[PDB]
Structure formats: C-alpha cells, structure tokens
Design a binder for these strands. Structure first.
Length: 123
RNA sequence: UGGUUGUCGUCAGCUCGUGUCGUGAGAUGUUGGGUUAAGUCCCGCAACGAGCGCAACCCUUGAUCUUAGUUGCCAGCAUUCA
C-alpha cells in the first residue's frame, strides 16, 4: 500500500517546489513539469520514495535506532517538536549548534549543566 | 642567572580544551548588531566551553542603630582660674 495517497500529498502541497531560478539540476529527476514559473515535484516518484523511507525508519526503529528530527525553518519548528514528542524522539528546532554530533562530549557537559540547575531549582 | 623592580598600562586585552574550515602557515571561537569605564552585558553566529585579565570580594571616607563610658565628652545640677 502507498503509505500516503497522492490526494493527501496534493492537499498538503507536496507538489509545490521553489522558483525556477533556484532550481538544482540534480533535482531534475524529481521534477514533473514547470507551471507559472514554479517547478512542480513529481508526486508519482514522491509516493514511491516516501513509502521506502517509512519502511526504512520502521526497520531502524525496531532495531532500537534513535532518530533525531531537525528543522530550524520557521514553518517546521513546531511540527518537528510535536511529532518528535509523540514518537518519544529527540529534536533540534531552534538553532543547530555547530559540533552537536562531531563534538558530542562538549555538548554533553552543557546538557549535564542544565540538569544541575533544574535540580537546584526543584530542591 | 635566581629574587626583586620600571615600562607600555589599570591600558582591555592575552590565551587554551574539544569541534569545524585550510595542502599548509593559519582561521574560527575572540568577528558582527546594540550597550559599557571595561573581551562589561544582551542578541546574532561552526562553533561549544574554560582560564588569566575586567568587575566584585579587602582598606579608608561620607549617614545611622546596638554594645562600651576612661585617660575622651559636659546637656541638664551645683561649685573652679581652668
């Protein structure tokens, strides 16, 4: 089964891309046509690719994989947090701090710090 | 040479851990928008923190309460050259 129907994708506006002047030639594989100066994403391949992504995530999640939802874009900040909270996963919705993954030890110390201040406030 | 001192200069600066960028020396952080006496503080930001500086902690002066009332003080009380 298609994890998402083309009707839902159309209502969600998945077919809307960016302006022709901002197009990436590598994205040509996923573009269906151009209309009114805006590129339209090929929803037929979109359905197939979304189905693969959902299955991959489910396999990875069943192996205990931790998925981090990242979106600082103003339109996405709220959605990322709400959906991550529902799934019990982590999110970065305000600003990605450089070194969050490559310098994980340094971030953990700051994470530890926050928890200490919380305990001082509660106690 | 040790120890000590002058000097830039009581100027607001000088660095480091990890990360990232650069073939490399390096850079970033520490730049930028406001603000400050100040790298002082806020915000932004491939940076995230830390340290020596800055400020504060110390001394003195300016107000006042408590304790203490002599060798200090004399208002109310008499007396003295005081």
């Amino acid at each position: 089964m298609s994890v998402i129907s083309m009707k839902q994708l159309l209502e969600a506006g998945v077919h809307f891309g960016h302006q022709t002047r901002r197009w990436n030639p590598k994205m040509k594989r996923y573009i269906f046509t151009e209309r009114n100066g805006i590129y339209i994403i090929d929803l037929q391949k979109t359905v197939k690719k979304v189905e693969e992504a959902y299955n991959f995530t489910k396999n990875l999640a069943a192996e205990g994989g931790k998925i981090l939802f990242v979106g600082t874009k103003k339109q996405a900040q709220d959605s990322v947090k709400e959906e991550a909270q529902r799934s019990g996963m982590y999110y970065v919705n305000q600003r990605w701090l450089g070194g969050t993954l490559t310098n994980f030890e340094t971030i953990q110390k700051r994470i530890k710090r926050l928890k200490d201040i919380e305990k001082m406030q509660e106690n």
